[PDB]
Design a binder for this molecule. Structure first.
Ligand SMILES: [Ca+2]
Length: 284
């Protein structure tokens, strides 16, 4: 097991209550079976990255007091990695590692497009309908409601807002776009994972029964970056040392969603347990 406890981090504080199961579906369970100490920080989605960073620091302070651990190994997804980067930047002595999994480390082109849609910035009406319906299909599958207050979550994840975030917290960002950052910055280890939607939809296996997957493929087509997971471009995910980012998976497939339904019979959970063992091998 890892020297320092693992902290799974995501945005959407209410996910577990509203949906009825975890954001990192089946992943904390798997990690505990391999003897790791695991905790989950569910952060507020409808505010800034810096506010989520402060929220996570308070979580971490309370966790460290309760574990007598010196540091934490962050594994984050989407929003999570930015909040992890805030804590690591400001409180490096308490952070053993930041692992970014499909993190919005340089902004989301879909977030950019939603702002344009909300501001009515000359977005053709046929495009407006495909994006909102794709988002509604994704949210309905989780919440169970049959019906776009989601702008609240995407506001902080635009290319403009994340560029501003990166300006304050540049640690471990790649010098060249789509490249690799420094593995160790100020004592803290940084790693990234990623994915992008690949292949024709027919050969997706498990995802054929996941209504969110077709929705992610619609959103995929509106990116300027062709390699994207439906919400984030491949290059935008990069932070610190790359492990692997060519998985044929959409954004939520990489957190084993919906409820285990993923692409191409890939063992998503094994990505997390193998990385946990890798962290252990690095004396973390
Ligand atoms: Ca899926």
């Amino acid at each position: 097991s890892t020297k320092y406890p693992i902290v799974l981090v995501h945005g959407l504080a209410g996910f577990n209550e509203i949906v009825g199961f975890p954001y990192f579906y089946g992943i904390a369970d798997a990690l505990r079976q391999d003897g790791h100490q695991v905790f989950t920080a569910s952060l507020s989605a409808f505010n800034s990255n810096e506010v989520r960073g402060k929220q996570l620091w308070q979580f971490v302070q309370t966790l460290l007091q309760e574990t007598q651990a010196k540091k934490v190994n962050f594994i984050g997804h989407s929003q999570g990695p930015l909040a992890c980067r805030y804590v690591a930047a400001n409180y490096p002595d308490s952070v053993a590692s930041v692992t970014s999994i499909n993190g919005v480390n340089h902004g989301s082109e879909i977030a950019d497009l939603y702002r344009r849609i909300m501001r009515k910035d000359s977005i053709p009406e046929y495009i407006v309908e495909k994006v909102l319906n794709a988002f509604g299909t994704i949210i309905s599958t989780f919440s169970g409601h049959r019906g776009q207050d989601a702008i609240a979550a995407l506001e902080s994840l635009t290319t403009e807002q994340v560029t501003e975030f990166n300006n304050k917290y540049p640690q471990a960002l790649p010098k060249t776009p789509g490249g690799e950052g420094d593995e160790i910055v100020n004592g803290v280890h940084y790693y990234c994972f990623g994915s992008y939607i690949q292949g024709l939809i027919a050969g997706e296996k498990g995802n054929l029964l996941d209504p969110t997957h077709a929705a992610m493929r619609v959103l995929n087509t509106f990116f300027t970056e062709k390699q994207n997971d439906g919400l984030v471009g491949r290059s935008s995910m990069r932070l610190g040392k790359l492990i692997k980012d060519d998985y044929a998976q959409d954004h939520i497939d990489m957190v084993n969603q919906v409820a285990g339904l993923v692409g191409y019979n890939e063992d998503i959970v094994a990505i997390y347990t193998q990385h946990a063992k890798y962290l252990a091998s690095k004396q973390l």
